[PDB]
Amino acid sequence: DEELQTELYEIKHQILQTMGVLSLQGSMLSVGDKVFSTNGQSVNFDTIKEMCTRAGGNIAVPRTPEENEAIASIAKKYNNYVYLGMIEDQTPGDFHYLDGASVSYTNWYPGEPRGQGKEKCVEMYTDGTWNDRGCLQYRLAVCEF
Amino acid sequence: DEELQTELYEIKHQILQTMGVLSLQGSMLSVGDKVFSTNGQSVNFDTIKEMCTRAGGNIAVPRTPEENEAIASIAKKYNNYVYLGMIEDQTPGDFHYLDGASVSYTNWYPGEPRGQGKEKCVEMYTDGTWNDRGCLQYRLAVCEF
Amino acid sequence: DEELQTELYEIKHQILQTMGVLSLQGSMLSVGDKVFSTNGQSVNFDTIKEMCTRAGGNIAVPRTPEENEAIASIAKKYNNYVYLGMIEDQTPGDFHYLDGASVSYTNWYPGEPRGQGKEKCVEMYTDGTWNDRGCLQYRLAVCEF
Ligand SMILES: [Sm+3]
Ligand SMILES: [Sm+3]
Ligand SMILES: [Sm+3]
Ligand SMILES: [Sm+3]
Ligand SMILES: [Sm+3]
Ligand SMILES: [Sm+3]
């Protein structure tokens, strides 16, 4: 109805404001319709997935050049690598999102995937490029909502 | 209308995201439709009520086993007891919510209510159990929204 | 429809809750429909405008006695002066909001506008009164959303 249009405006305004506050505080990064955020912790892959899901989100994963630079900037800011939301399929060499879908956008550091042993997980360098690796290292936890 | 369904979806998405960010940062705890939060201050009862109301909320009070454990976890995290949103009625022994209603859910430490003198307020131990007491101690301020 | 009224209620509730959390944490100040917030940085005027706009807001500017005291309180809290969202028009003596409109509400410290040289910007004293000045000083960044 009439009052309906009104209320919707106020709500939109408020959400924008709170999103502005968290942005200014640097506690979140908005890219398109994805929101990236970190609590500053550096734990292993399994642990990170828990944190994100516990918070209502998911371990972060870039699907576009812009989302990738957004996550890299957080990594750069904390001077630590980031574990991305993806693991290697059954047939080595290929990676898939946790939902099971196979990865589309990639940004491997020249030569990767390449490595010592299994290397089923993916870490992001502070420059944004990816490197496959083990899942037991301590990496900055970054989630997407 | 049509565009209406759309806008409602975006709004819901955004709220969820911001709520996810505050959860990940550990600045809030969501339980059912209640949100618990603390600013880390340790002040007396009167002071706590002011803080909560000033922030648009109310001094926290558990009404279910789950809300109780949620508040205890915050108490445990800060290693301090929490003053709950309740005071003793006119007739000693009984407690009521600040709205005037008489308490339903309780989780007294074995023996409580029991104590030295008046003990009109209620503090929560780090294990979740309650103990009645004075209202002038310095306790962690926790609010519910 | 029916379910519509329901969803609107939940949304309003959630927004209120998150706004309560940011208020309790002291990360934002709500005055009427304006939200003021600071990241604690002390940079020059140009830099401040960037921060605010980058966060989806604008450099703060009081338009009522209440908004003015709200900003002063933040200034008082950080013990630093605040650059306001306004610059001097083409004809010295008069100031305008960044949108181009000429200022309405003012709260100059007795004697101001008055000063050394150009003084095209406006800083707020910790008591709330304004003083015109250069735009290259390091002042607390405060944004409005
Ligand atoms: Sm490798
Ligand atoms: Sm492999
Ligand atoms: Sm007792
Ligand atoms: Sm008694
Ligand atoms: Sm001056
Ligand atoms: Sm001048």
Residue A113 tokens read as 């995937």
Ligand in nearest proximity to the CA of A90: 2
- Ligand 5 centre to CA of C130 (Å) is 9
Residue B52, domain CATH: 3.10.100.10
Chain C within 8 Å of B23 (Cβ-Cβ)? no
Chain B within 8 Å of C55 (Cβ-Cβ)? no
Residue A59 tokens read as 């371990």
One-letter-per-residue 3-state SS of chain A: CHHHHHHHHHHHHHHHHHHHHHHHCCCCEEECCEEEEEEEEEECHHHHHHHHHHCCCEECCCCCHHHHHHHHHHHHHHCCCEEEEEEECCCCCCEEECCCCECCCCCECCCCCCCCCCCCEEEECCCCCEEEECCCCCEEEEEEC
Q: Residue C88 sits in which domain range?
A: 1-145
Determination technique for this entry: X-ray
Cα distance between residue C16 and residue B145, in whole Å: 8
A·C CB contacts under 8 A: 55
CA angle (C23, C54, C73) in 5-degree steps: 35
* Residue B129 · residue B109 · CB < 8 Å: yes
One-letter-per-residue 3-state SS of C77-128: HHCCCEEEEEEECCCCCCEEECCCCECCCCCECCCCCCCCCCCCEEEECCCC
Strand partners, C114: none
Q: Which amino acid, residue A143?
A: C
Task: Give the residue among A145, A138, A112 at the shortest CA–CA distance from A44.
Answer: A138
In angstroms, what is the resolution? 2.5
Overall number of domains in chain C: 1
- Ligand 3 centre to CA of B47 (Å) is 21
Task: Give the residue among A22, C27, C25 at the shortest CA–CA distance from B15.
Answer: A22
Give the relative orientation of helices C2-24 and B2-24 as an angle to the nearest 10 degrees: 30
Chain breaks after residues in chain A, where C lies over 2.5 Å from next N: none
Residue C34 tokens read as 């304006």
Cα distance between residue B117 and residue C9, in whole Å: 44
Cα distance between residue A14 and residue C100, in whole Å: 25
Give the H/E segment covering residue B72: helix B65-78
Chain C within 8 Å of A79 (Cβ-Cβ)? no
CA angle (C49, C51, C52) in 5-degree steps: 65
B76 C-beta neighbours (distance < 10 Å), count: 14
